[PDB]
Amino acid sequence: KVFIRSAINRVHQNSAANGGELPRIVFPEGTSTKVLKALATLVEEKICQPILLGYPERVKEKIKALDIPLLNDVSIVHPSSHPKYFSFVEKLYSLRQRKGINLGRAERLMADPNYFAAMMVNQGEADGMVSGSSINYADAVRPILQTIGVYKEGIPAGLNFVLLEDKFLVLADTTVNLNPTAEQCAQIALQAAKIVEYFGIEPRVAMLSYSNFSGAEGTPRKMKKAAEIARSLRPDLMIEGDMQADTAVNPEIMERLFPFSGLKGGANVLVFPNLESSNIAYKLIQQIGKAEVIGPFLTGVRRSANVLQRTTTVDGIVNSVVFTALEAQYIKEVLKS
Amino acid sequence: VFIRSAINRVHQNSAANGGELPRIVFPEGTSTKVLKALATLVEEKICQPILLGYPERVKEKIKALDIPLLNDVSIVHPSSHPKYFSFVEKLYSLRQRKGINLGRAERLMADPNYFAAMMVNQGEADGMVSGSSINYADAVRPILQTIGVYKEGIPAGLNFVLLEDKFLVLADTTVNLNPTAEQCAQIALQAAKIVEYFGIEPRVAMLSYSNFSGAEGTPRKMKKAAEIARSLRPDLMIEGDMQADTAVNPEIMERLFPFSGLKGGANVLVFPNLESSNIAYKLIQQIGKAEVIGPFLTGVRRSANVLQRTTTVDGIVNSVVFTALEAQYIKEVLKS
Amino acid sequence: VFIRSAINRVHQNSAANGGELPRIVFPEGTSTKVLKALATLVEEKICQPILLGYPERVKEKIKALDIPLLNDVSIVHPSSHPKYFSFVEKLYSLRQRKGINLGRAERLMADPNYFAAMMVNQGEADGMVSGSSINYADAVRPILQTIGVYKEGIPAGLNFVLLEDKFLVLADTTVNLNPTAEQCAQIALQAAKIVEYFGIEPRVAMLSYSNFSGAEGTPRKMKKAAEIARSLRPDLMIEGDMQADTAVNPEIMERLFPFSGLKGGANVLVFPNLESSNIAYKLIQQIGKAEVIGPFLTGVRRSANVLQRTTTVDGIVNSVVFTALEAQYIKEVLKSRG
Amino acid sequence: KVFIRSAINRVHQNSAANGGELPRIVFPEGTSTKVLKALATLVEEKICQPILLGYPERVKEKIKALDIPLLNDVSIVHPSSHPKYFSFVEKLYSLRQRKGINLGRAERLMADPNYFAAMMVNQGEADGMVSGSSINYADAVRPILQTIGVYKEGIPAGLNFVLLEDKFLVLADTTVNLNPTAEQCAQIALQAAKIVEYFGIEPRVAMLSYSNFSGAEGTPRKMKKAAEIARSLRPDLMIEGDMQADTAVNPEIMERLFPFSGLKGGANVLVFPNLESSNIAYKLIQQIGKAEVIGPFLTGVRRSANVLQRTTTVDGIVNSVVFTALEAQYIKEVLKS
Amino acid sequence: VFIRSAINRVHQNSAANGGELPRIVFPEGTSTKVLKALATLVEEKICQPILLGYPERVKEKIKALDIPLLNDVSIVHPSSHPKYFSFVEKLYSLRQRKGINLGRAERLMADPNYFAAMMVNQGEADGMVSGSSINYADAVRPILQTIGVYKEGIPAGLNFVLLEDKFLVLADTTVNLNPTAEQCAQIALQAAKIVEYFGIEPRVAMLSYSNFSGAEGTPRKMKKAAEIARSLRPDLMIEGDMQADTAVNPEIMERLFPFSGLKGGANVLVFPNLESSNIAYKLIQQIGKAEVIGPFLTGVRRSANVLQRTTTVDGIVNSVVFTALEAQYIKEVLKS
Amino acid sequence: KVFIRSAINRVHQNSAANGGELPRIVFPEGTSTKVLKALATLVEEKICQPILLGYPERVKEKIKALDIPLLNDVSIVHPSSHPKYFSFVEKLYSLRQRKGINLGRAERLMADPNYFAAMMVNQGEADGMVSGSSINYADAVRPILQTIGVYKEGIPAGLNFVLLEDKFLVLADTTVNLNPTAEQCAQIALQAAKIVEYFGIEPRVAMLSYSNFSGAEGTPRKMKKAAEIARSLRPDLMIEGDMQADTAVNPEIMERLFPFSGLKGGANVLVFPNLESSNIAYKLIQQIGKAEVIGPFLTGVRRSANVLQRTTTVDGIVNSVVFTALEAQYIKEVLKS
Ligand SMILES: [Cl-]
Ligand SMILES: [Cl-]
Ligand SMILES: [Cl-]
Ligand SMILES: [Cl-]
Ligand SMILES: [Cl-]
Ligand SMILES: [Cl-]
């Protein structure tokens, strides 16, 4: 409620500090009913320049079918017909020619809106992309990781916000790594923490397990080791584990049962031991928890690109576009430095 | 409401059994949270509690907390009890080829947890509730060593998520780190019969991070778990592998996977590993603004349940209510 | 000569079946090498080709290359074909529990490789030839997902080495990275039935770097494969483990391993792993002075063969000839079973 | 045909530049009929000074049976009776005493001509040895590896020549390593390349696989890594992989399908991913191909020693001794420096 | 004879320190075999024995078996000891991130084995002797959890075989199931310093079923173990892999493997796994006709030894004697 | 002391009940000093008809060097010169031709006394063999296992006797299996029990471990299940485990500490969990204990053949030949049945 309006306003503060320019967000699924309805609400709010990918004739005919006159302008680009199509094909080929992709396969991949979108963002023809409403997560994210890639020492990891009364929680990694090592969960925590700091909040990080400070072999030792590695890398942050999820979020359970712990006031960063636990958790909270859940957002990647969960609603997509715009604005300012 | 109806079936059971209440032994006779919860439960006439401990330490804790309604409850000191010596032999004979000599059987039986487990095993009590003061592994081991699992059963923790129109069942939330496909099928079968006890049709989802991919690893494992379970209960809707929102939301299922055999949303959610079950039910309980009760230990021959170390007083109240139902149900099975 | 005898058998099979020719669909409707090969094969009355692609882009490629003999040939664009929607639904139903949603079933079936395989699966074509423009895995995946293997079969590539008096059969040259002893025996059984189709007695060698050692690893594997194969076909000469020259040269066998059950040199060579099979047929084809034809995909329920990406035009001519033979045979099996 | 005369002429050039001395080549199989028949032609051509091992009494008696009058003067040595025999036992014993070989067992191994030949070569009593016409390769090569050993950072690897009309191809490793690592395949390539360079030919190296530049896990990744490691060690050489075999040899297939590749004009060095592929390939080419195949020759060992494949012909032994004399002359010119 | 010189060393040591006797805590205050042994050890002025238990229950056992020299030996009940709660806080602090909450530290500290080990850890005693009544793992676990291993040390049991003209040292007879080459080297180094304490030159054999084969498995492990050990003590004869008769018999070594660096026979025998060490010292003790003393726990921060469950009264006497030696030695090291 | 004299007298019983014939025992090490010295003592005792293998002159020459006139008549056989040599080659070749052994290698193996002795025993040309005084155990036992082989469901296992004053113990497997399964350990127990029964003693079997009735994973579980399997196969015997070695031998410790145990009166058959423990134990008892240890004897094989430990003394060999002669006579009576 409040959190999403506040992000929208920060987009505007960012934009009025850069000559009124809006980030350009490319959408591979120019024909998606859910994407188009979401774009209707966000064009009224001046959050981004949408670019739709597809056949101009298909896309315009879907726009009027759904009766949304506010999209009669939005840029529409057909990948094969774009002037840069050949340049993009050659650059994908050069990236993948020793990873089993011949030239003709590079052409057919670059004709796919998902690859064309990722290459547009990589080449500065757009500032970000939002994809994945119509296809599964692996299919949508592979072009991004193949084309944009991860920044140095970074790790691709999905991140979700749980919006509670007077507080948000950050959950990660909800989408990418099946079974991260201790070193990977430490890095996932570091990425999640800098996101929390961007919002003016102190990150307090819990490495989750089924155990409370046992350190037994398997995930308890892994999450205990992840906390130690992370604490070494950010000695200023509260980072703790291994601990159970209720121990983590509830400060009264922590202090009563584990008062030696370095984590006071409840964790707002929840790093998971495997993909089963992160993925089932955010989805169950979203369905039954009666709290808004936004994301997942792809962290660790060089440019702003987020893959929607296939189960997303229209309002989900709205929320994801807003934060993709913020991400796009922030990355463009680091690159100016 | 779901809890009030449970309290009522408990009363219905005893009125059909001469008014007797199940005897539930509590190893943690001095536990502040257990004692406060029992104040509420003797008021509701749910069970006959039996506290384990040194009687003067138990009575002085009751006196400290000012719970006059507990002044009559039975207190048993393990080492002093008449059955102690025979209990020591029963444990020794059970574990003598599992690294337990007679002297260590004696000191194990003096521990309230083992004495409670044996009281229940020998029919001296109808059920037990433990684990408010110790970690779950320490509490559940005497139970599994002493009472054991019924044939083809698997010990698995189960939780209820109480929503407005409906409850969800989550398992296995406590015992198996990484159940196989065969074990996940058996966990589902155990949870399904519990849902049936309350007059609800069980609809089972084998959870994963994937929607019907069947790729190697947990997607393949949970897909076969659904198949094995479908084999064993051809009358039930059992499906997987699927993501959790796919599982619970019938409109998401119908839109994206209409070939699925699962209609109307799942009310039985079987997990692929212990991290996911345990973290999920705990996050739901803390932030999900739904009541979560349990975990309850399924698959074991007599009624025994281990509280989560993080439980509240009312948590313990809720767990005792359903332990009483469990003890009553098992008690008539064995009369057969 | 071996190829001429195959062409005549196609005509022999074709006669006694109302003069009908098998219908062979080609996913790569604009491929220069495919169209050049079809010019030669239309003159020989080997098959009725079906080209997949946008009809105008196919006709423009045909007119550019100046191949007047193809102006009549059937051209089908997958998205536009009447059965496209029906084909999408059968692929969706086949793969909906293997990570494929409906929108993806639609985009797969619009790919000529998937559409051709489904055409063959549904009897709208009698066989298919693909893979001149894509790597082998990309070509064979739709075939295996759609058509599948017959019971107890294993998908395995097979190549013919045509020598002066003699042909050898090599397998598995394309599919299995590292087949088990059980899989290598089945590969032998599949290759043997192919050799028998041509009226030749199959004599099977299970290849290794070792001569009758049975030591752990592949020597033990290939010795056990021969045993499993001998059990399943007690009438065949099948032997291993042995080196390749021991296998082919009957004089080396007799001098050095006279106890062996393999006399007169092997004409079926089953390989222990994919590196050895794939490298061998390719080196023989480039540096030997013998024709190598194939690979042909064995073990699948309907006729589909994947050209090696490195093929020539004459290679494609040869593969279509034997694909036509395969399609005619499988079509007789399917009528027998109705 | 041509290639062998040129090698024979290079032996004579080497021998004319060093006072007419010929390398001394020990043959453990002193009564092998094939070895003796080949030796008839090898002394008429001044290729080597042969040393036959055996009971002098039947070696002369095998020679008189076959009626090869040109060999009655050639040296014949009986291992047990040799003056150096007992000193040889002590060096083998000291080498193997912590590898399960007692003194009496060193005595029996050293009485085996294969071990005696190897010790002769190692200690400078001969310049090279040729063995293995009558025993399998592992049995024949074991004494060589235990006694002579590999030079520093070397790997024992068998190598074969395929003699084509304008050029030869070299295949390796055709005999020793079951499943070489990426690092081992790089070293095998370097050894093969210096052999090609000895003949004044530019080596062009293909790391073979069933894949064309895929780098997928398993051997495609291994052969891609071997090419990378080898290029690091020889930045001046064309070395490429992973690739299929026809891709490797045929320069037109390479240029058409993989024009980014650093390997132009066809590979003349073919390094295999495992012993099944190398061993089966050279033998199938030799039997059904119509090109002569010579070898295998043992590379990577400190001193000149080659194992004949048990399947060898009489001409094979001749070819194989010639190249052993060349290697022996080469090492002998290295050591004079 | 060897034991008499050890006893005389015990007196020699404390006489150089104002006559203290080391205080040795016995967790098994009612153990019959412990109590009879203490009768002999009180007469010999070896230590100050401290028995753990209910004092009247201990005194009642003492005069029942009519043991008369223990009427003035010290008796401590753990729960009643003044420092009990301070001991509780210290165990909690040591293990709070290894799965032990405050309440579980409390019941553990009431167990004599944990209380005894903590007494030694905090300097209220100089050593402890346990394990007569319980299996070795149960007794040694509190010791290792509480006292722990010194830097680069490895917990390893060691036994003496007393022959007519020499003793052999066997290790590791109790702790490590299957030590690595690195661990076997550290076991050899630890055994070497014990042999050096008695003024004999240690000569170490890394035992195997193989004679200098170096084949994969334990032959290679024991060959590499010798190499690592020789690296760390270049002055010592350390050799392997070799068979047991090859190791002890110098004429077999010289005749069959004269290249070996080990001459005059090995007096330190390091074993490749726990089956071989444990079966060997036990078989030698029963059927050989040589005295076997131990096992003694090496590698730990202060003096703690676990009796083998099969021990005799005389076994306990011998082990208490050397525990006194160990305690005196460690007590002078820490003074520095 | 007494036990060995009782074996000698039973040898005389067996021979008198069979026309005074002595078993024929082949000794591959015809020049072994310790073997020859042992045989002087054994020929006066009417234990066997020895057959020495080697060059006749080499043996006659060693016999006179050591001056034992009692051997001047003993049979000497030179394998390659023996009439049966060619048929024996043909038979070993037929046994091993699919295990990497060509015809010429069969010839050189059959010329080795160890293989020739094994084939003599196998073909009934001799009744037993004793080898291994001069070579390591694996080397001596390989020809026996390849040629004579194991009887049905048998397992080759070394067995030793520890002769205590009221009693003997049997230890196994002291030589062959590195790490037997539970099933192998049960079969080893069954083999050792029938040997104890041959001497009129009730076998009482302990499956040894470092644990007392824990059944924990690893060795405790293996030996507990080994006991269970063996009890199933011989329901008439006391067989128990897992237990420690002193628990096993001492009936008072067992009765005091594990009174539930099925093993009363102490174990006289000690089955070991791995080769480290068996081999180290019998060697330590033999050296530092004060009791006689005889063997090891090879159990589980179809015909009588035993390998001396390389460390044996002259008495050792005498003791081993005595029990080999008993074994040969027993097997010879079974074979006539
Ligand atoms: Cl997905
Ligand atoms: Cl817990
Ligand atoms: Cl390919
Ligand atoms: Cl070979
Ligand atoms: Cl123990
Ligand atoms: Cl040995």
Numbering used by the authors:
A (entry chain G), D (entry chain E), F (entry chain C): 440 to 776
B (entry chain A), E (entry chain B): 441 to 776
C (entry chain D): 441 to 778
What wording appears in the published article?
Bacterial hybrid malic enzymes (MaeB grouping, multidomain) catalyse the transformation of malate to pyruvate, and are a major contributor to cellular reducing power and carbon flux. The PTA domain is homologous to PTA enzymes (that interconvert acetyl-CoA and phosphate to CoA and acetyl phosphate), yet they appear to lack critical catalytic residues and thus acts as a sensor instead.
The role of hexamerization was further validated by an E544R obligate dimer variant, which was insensitive to inhibition by acetyl-CoA.
